[PDB]
Amino acid sequence: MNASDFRRRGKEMVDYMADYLEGIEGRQVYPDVQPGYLRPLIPATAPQEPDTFEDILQDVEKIIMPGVTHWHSPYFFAYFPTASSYPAMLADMLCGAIGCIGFSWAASPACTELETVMMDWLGKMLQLPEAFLAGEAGEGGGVIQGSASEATLVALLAARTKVVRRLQAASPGLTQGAVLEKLVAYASDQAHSSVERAGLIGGVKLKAIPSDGKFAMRASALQEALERDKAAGLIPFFVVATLGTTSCCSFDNLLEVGPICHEEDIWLHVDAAYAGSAFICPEFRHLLNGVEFADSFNFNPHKWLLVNFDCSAMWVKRRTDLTGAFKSGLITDYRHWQLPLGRRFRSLKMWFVFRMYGVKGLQAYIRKHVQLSHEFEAFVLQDPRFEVCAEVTLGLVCFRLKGSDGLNEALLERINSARKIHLVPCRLRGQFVLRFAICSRKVESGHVRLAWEHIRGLAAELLAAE
Amino acid sequence: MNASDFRRRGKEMVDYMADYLEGIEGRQVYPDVQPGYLRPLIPATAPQEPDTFEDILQDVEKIIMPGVTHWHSPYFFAYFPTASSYPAMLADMLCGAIGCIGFSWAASPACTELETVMMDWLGKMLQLPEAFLAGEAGEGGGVIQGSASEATLVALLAARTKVVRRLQAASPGLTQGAVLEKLVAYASDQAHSSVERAGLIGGVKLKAIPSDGKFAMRASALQEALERDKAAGLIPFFVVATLGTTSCCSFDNLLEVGPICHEEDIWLHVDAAYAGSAFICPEFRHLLNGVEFADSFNFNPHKWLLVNFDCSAMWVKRRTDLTGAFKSGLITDYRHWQLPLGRRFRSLKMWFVFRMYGVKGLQAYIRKHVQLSHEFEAFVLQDPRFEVCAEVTLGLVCFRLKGSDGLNEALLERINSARKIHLVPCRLRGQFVLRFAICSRKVESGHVRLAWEHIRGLAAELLAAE
Ligand SMILES: Cc1ncc(COP(=O)(O)O)c(/C=N/N[C@@](C)(Cc2ccc(O)c(O)c2)C(=O)O)c1O
Ligand SMILES: Cc1ncc(COP(=O)(O)O)c(/C=N/N[C@@](C)(Cc2ccc(O)c(O)c2)C(=O)O)c1O
Numbered sequence: 005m006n007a008s009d010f011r012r013r014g015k016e017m018v019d020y021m022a023d024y025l026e027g028i029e030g031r032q033v034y035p036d037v038q039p040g041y042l043r044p045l046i047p048a049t050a051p052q053e054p055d056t057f058e059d060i061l062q063d064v065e066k067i068i069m070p071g072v073t074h075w076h077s078p079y080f081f082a083y084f085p086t087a088s089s090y091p092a093m094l095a096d097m098l099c100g101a102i103g104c105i106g107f108s109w110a111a112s113p114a115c116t117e118l119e120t121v122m123m124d125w126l127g128k129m130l131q132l133p134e135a136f137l138a139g140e141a142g143e144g145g146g147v148i149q150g151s152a153s154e155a156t157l158v159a160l161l162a163a164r165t166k167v168v169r170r171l172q173a174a175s176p177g178l179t180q181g182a183v184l185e186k187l188v189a190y191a192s193d194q195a196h197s198s199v200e201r202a203g204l205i206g207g208v209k210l211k212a213i214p215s216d217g218k219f220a221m222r223a224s225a226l227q228e229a230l231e232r233d234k235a236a237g238l239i240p241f242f243v244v245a246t247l248g249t250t251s252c253c254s255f256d257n258l259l260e261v262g263p264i265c266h267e268e269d270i271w272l273h274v275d276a277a278y279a280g281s282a283f284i285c286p287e288f289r290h291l292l293n294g295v296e297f298a299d300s301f302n303f304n305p306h307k308w309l310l311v312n313f314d315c316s317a318m319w320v321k322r323r324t325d326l327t328g329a330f331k332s333g334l335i336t337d338y339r340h341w342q343l344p345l346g347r348r349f350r351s352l353k354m355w356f357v358f359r360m361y362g363v364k365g366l367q368a369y370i371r372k373h374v375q376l377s378h379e380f381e382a383f384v385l386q387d388p389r390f391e392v393c394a395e396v397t398l399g400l401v402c403f404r405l406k407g408s409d410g411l412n413e414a415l416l417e418r419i420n421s422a423r424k425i426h427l428v429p430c431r432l433r434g435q436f437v438l439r440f441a442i443c444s445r446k447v448e449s450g451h452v453r454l455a456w457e458h459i460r461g462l463a464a465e466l467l468a469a470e
Numbered sequence: 471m472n473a474s475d476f477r478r479r480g481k482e483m484v485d486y487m488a489d490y491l492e493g494i495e496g497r498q499v500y501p502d503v504q505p506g507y508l509r510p511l512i513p514a515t516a517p518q519e520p521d522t523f524e525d526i527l528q529d530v531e532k533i534i535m536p537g538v539t540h541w542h543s544p545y546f547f548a549y550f551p552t553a554s555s556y557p558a559m560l561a562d563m564l565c566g567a568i569g570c571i572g573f574s575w576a577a578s579p580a581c582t583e584l585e586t587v588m589m590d591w592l593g594k595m596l597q598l599p600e601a602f603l604a605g606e607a608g609e610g611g612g613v614i615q616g617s618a619s620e621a622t623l624v625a626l627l628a629a630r631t632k633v634v635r636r637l638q639a640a641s642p643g644l645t646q647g648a649v650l651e652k653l654v655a656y657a658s659d660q661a662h663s664s665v666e667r668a669g670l671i672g673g674v675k676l677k678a679i680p681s682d683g684k685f686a687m688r689a690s691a692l693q694e695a696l697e698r699d700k701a702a703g704l705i706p707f708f709v710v711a712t713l714g715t716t717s718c719c720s721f722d723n724l725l726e727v728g729p730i731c732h733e734e735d736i737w738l739h740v741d742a743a744y745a746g747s748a749f750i751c752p753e754f755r756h757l758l759n760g761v762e763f764a765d766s767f768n769f770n771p772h773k774w775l776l777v778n779f780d781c782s783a784m785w786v787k788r789r790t791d792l793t794g795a796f797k798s799g800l801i802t803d804y805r806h807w808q809l810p811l812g813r814r815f816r817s818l819k820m821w822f823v824f825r826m827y828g829v830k831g832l833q834a835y836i837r838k839h840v841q842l843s844h845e846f847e848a849f850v851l852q853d854p855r856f857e858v859c860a861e862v863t864l865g866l867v868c869f870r871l872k873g874s875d876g877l878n879e880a881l882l883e884r885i886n887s888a889r890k891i892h893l894v895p896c897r898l899r900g901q902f903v904l905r906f907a908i909c910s911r912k913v914e915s916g917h918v919r920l921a922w923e924h925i926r927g928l929a930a931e932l933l934a935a936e
Pocket of ligand 2: 345346620662712741772779
């Protein structure tokens with residue numbers, strides 16, 4: 005294919021993309037295909053000779069689309085949002101055309117330089133402490149990671165190297181392996197499974213801190229764990245505090261946990277994968293208070309800030325703490341800030357989104373989602389057959405039918421079966437709970453109301469049947 | 471920005487992209503900007519209100535482009551190729567529009583299913599042993615990794631878990647940490663630095679095996695290392711064999727190393743990042759002989775098979791050996807095959823590239839690059855002031871002016887300073903060598919001839935001046 009054919013097909017593809025997202029309400033959110041559906045529908049071998057673009061697009065529609073779960077449908081209320089915005093898509097187009105691999109500064113100066121500035125822009129939007137900004141002369145700075153899962157692992161490895169060096173300074177005989185046996189990392193019992201993965205890869209013990217009645221990590225529970233573990237001769241080296249847990253979008257208490265990590269010289273990583281986007285709005289920024297105690301802070305623009313995956317945003321206060329694991333002001337060498345060596349020009353996506361929405365546009369997006377969340381909450385609160393199971397702060401409502409877990413499992417099954425909307429459950433303290441997450445860029449009140457009416461109607465049939 | 475504006479700007483962007491790649495010969499390959507050039511040219515803060523798309527595109531041209539190294543210029547002869555093809559760009563567009571995160575089967579069946587099939591397609595094109603194919607009932611299979619650097623780490627972690635379990639089976643009291651102290655990994659002295667990073671992250675010793683006169687790892691040198699290390703009480707657990715080293719595109723001898731790894735129960739990972747694309751051509755497939763002994767095999771379509779970054783292709787014989795690190799036939803759960811949990815629909819890029827080029831088109835691309843490589847070799851061989859420093863097999867020629875390293879350092883400086891072409895050096899056994907790598911999709915004979923005439927003319931001035 006040459007530039008001239010690309011001019012034609014590229015424009016066709018633009019129309020296909022826009023048609024897909026514009027017409028997405030008409031698609032069934034969750035597929036009816038069984039596991040294994042695809043292989044028998046396409047050839048066992050790559051073609052010797054080219055297929056036409058037309059044949060491929062037909063296959064997209066007839067073979068791929070039936071096996072797609074439509075994340076961007078208004079009726080997708082599962083997990084947390086993933087980002088989809090046209091500015092991000094435009095940037096990704098340009099990103100691919102430039103097509104540099106920014107494993108060094110010389111491989112494309114702008115690929116590195118734009119990223120540092122975008123991380124400063126975003127740092128300032130979040131009102132991060134200045135310690136996290138690169139600027140002209142900062143020791144800190146930010147980096148795009150592929151994902152929060154990777155960010156957490158990066159932070160864990162930096163923390164591991166750091167505590168190892170601290171110990172080996174005092175006892176030069178000590179091997180990495182002897183240190184590893186003693187190390188212990190902590191996270192909330194509501195922490196994302198990415199934390200456990202990081203612990204497994206990092207070769208360290210990971211212990212869960214019991215959350216309080218609001219599913220938050222607190223000083224007292226951390227302190228208790230630390231005392232027990234220190235007395236057994238273990239060395240706490242890393243804590244992940246989660247702002248916006250997956251289960252119920254609860255918030256670890258950084259103001260309590262931060263001082264403890266400072267006094268014990270424990271690396272404090274803040275995972276705000278979802279919730280972090282909200283901190284660009286002043287009315288939510290209080291939830292990030294205490295981040296000044298963190299060694300590293302991460303959230304995903306690719307969840308809730310309209311920057312298409314992959315784009316996870318991580319900042320550190322001390323670049324040498326980070327870069328030491330992998331060996332001020334201007335960053336030339338992002339390869340020491342992340343697991344891979346290669347990277348693409350992902351910062352274009354941030355620049356386009358930030359410039360095309362503006363801060364105000366992004367704030368309006370967040371606030372609309374939170375309003376819709378509360379609109380759904382209001383429905384649930386006014387129905388005495390249901391209960392809300394946790395405080396609603398952002399775009400997630402946890403709710404259930406009053407009654408047994410079985411009733412709620414049956415309700416979920418009926419919702420899934422009806423194929424109008426897609427939701428997933430969680431367990432909160434052994435209890436089965438339905439999650440309603442505001443996801444789509446295009447969700448409106450009307451969608452939420454119809455989702456609720458749909459849920460309420462199924463619940464009514466279920467309750468009569470009992 | 472809504473669908474309607476995207477239809478307009480998306481098409482503008484398509485034209486911008488095509489203009490960039492079509493006109494790319496007119497760009498200076500390597501930029502003149504100094505580190506830190508960008509920050510003063512753009513604002514310190516995100517805008518409150520939207521900027522226009524026009525202003526953004528102006529900035530791309532006037533501020534970004536001066537800091538871009540043009541990987542896709544015909545006159546870029548640095549490193550190894552990175553992939554740029556219009557079919558891959560079309561797929562990436564669609565990938566972003568669908569916008570699923572394929573962290574589970576239910577998150578989008580096709581996102582997982584298409585990938586397994588494309589890895590089988592690619593496996594068949596490379597004539598991999600059947601042990602590596604998923605098919606209907608295979609224990610093995612393939613996965614897209616973000617990069618070869620990540621693939622190598624994934625393999626190392628799987629290898630680490632496997633040997634750890636073996637050692638704990640004999641000695642159940644042994645901690646992960648006590649095992650780590652004993653473990654030793656090996657790679658060629660020409661192995662890519664990704665291997666050392668994998669060893670560092672994985673917490674294990676990495677030792678270099680001395681390469682032979684053709685910069686190849688051989689049985690005798692491996693065996694000697696193993697015997698020495700075993701007698702010191704170390705436990706070999708992982709070997710990376712490199713097909714297509716960065717320095718001089720040399721090839722480790724898999725037929726020799728494979729049996730040794732089998733007999734010693736050492737995990738054998740094959741890194742064919744660059745060279746692996748050539749193995750779809752029968753005349754190069756012999757270089758992969760012995761891969762039947764490998765536990766894992768990896769190469770980058772995002773180097774030399776026209777699948778834009780990110781797309782690294784990894785296969786294993788035994789999915790449970792891989793899966794066990796992160797805890798037949800149909801794969802539903804790629805999250806146990808890679809470090810991140812999240813992933814996008816990257817397999818679209820493979821499908822589009824393979825379908826729009828066909829196997830024959832891909833073969834023709836590889837063969838044309840290899841012919842151009844030999845054309846450059848032929849120029850060097852006819853000029854008695856120069857020498858070729860290693861066997862030319864694929865798209866890389868190592869060459870130097872006969873004389874001192876300093877003369878060749880000066881020649882490189884003159885080339886870089888003239889800003890017509892971009893090349894990088896290496897050291898081969900302490901000797902300074904220039905590398906000429908065929909990179910751009912659009913390189914032709916004429917570009918290679920002009921590059922050589924340019925190089926020869928600089929050398930002439932340098933030699934007269936001495
Ligand atoms: C609190 C918390 N911490 C870390 C992570 C890992 O983030 P990742 O590695 O994916 O960037 C998650 C992840 N959320 N996982 C979802 C909500 C699925 C999901 C949805 C949208 C996405 O854009 C996405 O990447 C993943 C889940 O259901 O687990 C997290 O919530
Ligand atoms: C033998 C060998 N093994 C592993 C890797 C890691 O590959 P990655 O992690 O990037 O996928 C490389 C990498 N090569 N690096 C280049 C040639 C630069 C380069 C050029 C084009 C790219 O598409 C790319 O990703 C990287 C170098 O000069 O180091 C490798 O050569």
